[PDB]
């Protein structure tokens, strides 16, 4: 029984070291560029970049005054909803529907990092406009959070309805109305509560996941839910590990459950579609609506407006 | 321009580095040289005695 | 000290090892280069 | 086959568990590709400018068909 | 004759494995040695725009 | 000094030099055949 | 800092390509030394090892490295 | 239909072929430009007084 | 599907022909002139004609010849 000498198990073992050799330099290579690159930024990231945004004459308490005050092209405008409240500036959408909203969250370019602490989702980041073409006002929208601190209170002065929408990489979209929209304050952990849903995205907020099921989608529900960031966590899971955070390093700040139904504060992904490998922790944490889209698909654009609400 | 002072840095980053490394190889070699040399004196002192017998 | 020298000194090396690379790749490049001659000659 | 045998075993071990150690590190880069790519584009809204750049996938993923395609038998 | 390069070709084999395993470590040091370069990037990264 | 001895001969490391030069060999051989192919063809 | 980091590497391709010719030579010493004290055992063991010398090789990449030090 | 996936292939020789030919030509006057080059030099010369 | 892929081919292919076909022109002159060039400075002096007529014979077909592809 000495056919027991295999001389193929040494005319093949070079072959695993073609492909494995390849692959090694290959991966020495991609060090390469990635090397240059975070270096040619970093020089880049000596001088910052800058804009001239000339305030409108016209304020008020939130952008419907304004726009019933005769502003009527979407820009930037400085508002104040209290008088205690030293003012603050936001961008104002005049154009979608009836105009009178109040921008809270938008994203369209990966310009901005979300991912950020507990204090800077109070306070907000992010620029609120940009400067365009051969003008002198702000007048099309950044990246931003305008605040935990800041949205509570503009939400808890009476009636606040709420807009929702997003755009595919494809150049699809859709909208997400909540007629009523709250959040509380910092001693009552800004928990959100919305009802009176209608749109093409689908119920997210109140109903979940649209592809979970019983139990399944009874935990991805954001509604009356906390808010958390990585590094202030107060999600659904009370198994007391560490290990079960919805908010981990680099991961966006947002009302979790255990975890989300969908997820504008998100990482933004190139392209579209992510997988597993993709993301640094393996979670499913991009800009996510899942009602329409799935669990790896990050959003093109999601912006997140608001407006009083008088009976209709 | 500053186009052809460009890729001269980048250039010159490649034969510091190709010269640091033919000093490599020579010094390498100046240390196997010498390495074969105590070698052939062991095939001295076996290339005395005159054949047997 | 002492020693401390002479050792981060012999981080040689992967000098080599890029120079390995730098090598493979002129290899490799080469090879591509070549199938392609070999099938466009029959052809 | 006591000095062959004792070979194609030790230097069988050898391979089959790196390539599953550098599997890893394939995905590893795979993950810091893209974290990057990320984290830079991030700059635009701080920075004077930004690296116009893209991550090359249907790379990362055609060198991982490979090592899947590879791992049949020792 | 036969048993002759078969451990022969097997030490041409093992200072590669030894070779390949030996970027594998040296990537490895260079992959750590990136994301303390990218954790600085991220520092020079939240300030918005200068108005 | 316990450590730091063995650790030394560790990165007293040739395969390195021998596998860029496996490689450049390798290399230059295939120069020599690809001229020929281009040669090849042209012809 | 052009004149200055290139002057500073033709600089080294001589203290570097002199160490050159240096261990080109003493590579024919041994190569020729050792043919001499391979045969010097002819007469003291069983076999004596058949091999050749080969030196218009060595006095081939020997004008290489000669007539480049022409130019500067 | 049978011919009609081998004619692909009798017709696709003739696509590699043909980029055969053009890469040939655009190699062969990039070489020819050279060569030009070096006749700009040899004829700057005003005729010897 | 395979028929389809041809074209993609065989026009990227085709519209670098005329861009060759072009150089071919701009060289054949650029080549009349640098030789003429010549008259002045070398004892001989290379006598020639310039066959246009044949590349705007051969420009007359290849796009008398680019039909449409498949779209309709």
Redesign the interface.
């Known amino acids: 029984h ?1 056919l ?3 001389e193929t ?2 005319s093949n ?1 070079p ?3 073609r ?13 390469q560029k ?2 240059s ?6 020089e ?10 000339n305030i409108p004459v016209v304020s008020g308490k939130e952008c419907e005054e304004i726009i019933r005050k005769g502003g009527e092209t979407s820009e930037m405008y400085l508002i104040q909803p209290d008088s205690s409240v030293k003012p603050y500036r936001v961008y104002c959408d005049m154009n979608t529907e009836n105009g009178g909203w109040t921008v809270i969250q938008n994203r369209q ?5 979300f991912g950020r602490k507990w204090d800077p989702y109070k306070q907000g ?3 609120v406009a ?1 400067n365009t073409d051969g003008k002198n006002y702000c007048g099309l929208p ?3 959070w305008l605040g935990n601190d800041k949205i509570s209170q503009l939400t808890r002065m009476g009636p606040t309805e709420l807009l929702i929408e997003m755009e595919d990489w494809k150049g699809d979209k859709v909208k997400a109305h909540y007629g009523g929209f709250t959040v509380q304050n910092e001693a009552n952990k800004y928990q959100i509560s919305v009802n009176k849903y209608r749109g093409t995205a689908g119920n997210a907020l109140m109903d979940g996941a649209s592809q979970l099921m019983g139990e399944n989608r009874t935990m991805t529900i954001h509604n009356g839910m906390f808010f958390s960031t990585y590094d202030r966590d107060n999600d659904g899971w009370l198994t007391s590990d560490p290990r079960k955070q919805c908010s981990k390093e ?1 991961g966006g700040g947002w009302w979790y459950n255990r975890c989300h139904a969908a997820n504008p504060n998100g ?5 579209g579609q ?1 997988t597993w ?4 922790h393996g979670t499913d944490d991009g800009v996510v609506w899942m009602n329409w889209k799935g669990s790896w698909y990050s959003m093109r654009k999601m912006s997140m407006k608001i407006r009083p609400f008088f009976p209709q | 321009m500053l186009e052809e002072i460009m890729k001269y840095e980048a250039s010159i980053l490649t034969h510091d580095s190709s010269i640091r490394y033919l000093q490599e190889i020579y010094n390498s070699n100046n240390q196997k040289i010498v390495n074969l040399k105590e070698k052939v004196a062991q095939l001295e002192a076996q290339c005395q005695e005159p054949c047997k017998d | 000290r002492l020693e401390k020298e002479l050792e981060e000194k012999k981080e040689a090396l992967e000098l080599a090892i890029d120079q390995a690379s730098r090598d493979y790749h002129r290899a490799t490049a080469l090879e591509k280069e070549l199938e392609e001659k070999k099938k466009a000659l029959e052809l | 086959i006591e000095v062959l045998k004792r070979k194609v075993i030790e230097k069988v071990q050898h391979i089959q568990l790196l390539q599953k150690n550098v599997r890893a590190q394939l995905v590893d880069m795979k993950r810091l590709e893209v974290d990057i790519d990320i984290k830079i584009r991030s700059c635009r809204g701080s920075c004077s400018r930004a690296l116009a750049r893209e991550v090359d996938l249907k790379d990362y993923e055609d060198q991982q068909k490979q090592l899947e395609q590879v791992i049949a038998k020792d």
Request: net charge negative.
């Open positions: 000495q027991y000498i295999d198990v040494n073992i072959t695993n070291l492909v494995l050799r390849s692959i090694l330099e290959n991966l020495r290579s991609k060090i990635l090397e690159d975070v270096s040619a930024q970093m880049y990231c000596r001088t910052p970049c800058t804009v001239s945004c370019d990966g310009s901005v990092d980041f992010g620029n940009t950044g990246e931003y680099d990482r933004y992904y190139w392209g992510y490998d993709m993301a640094k």
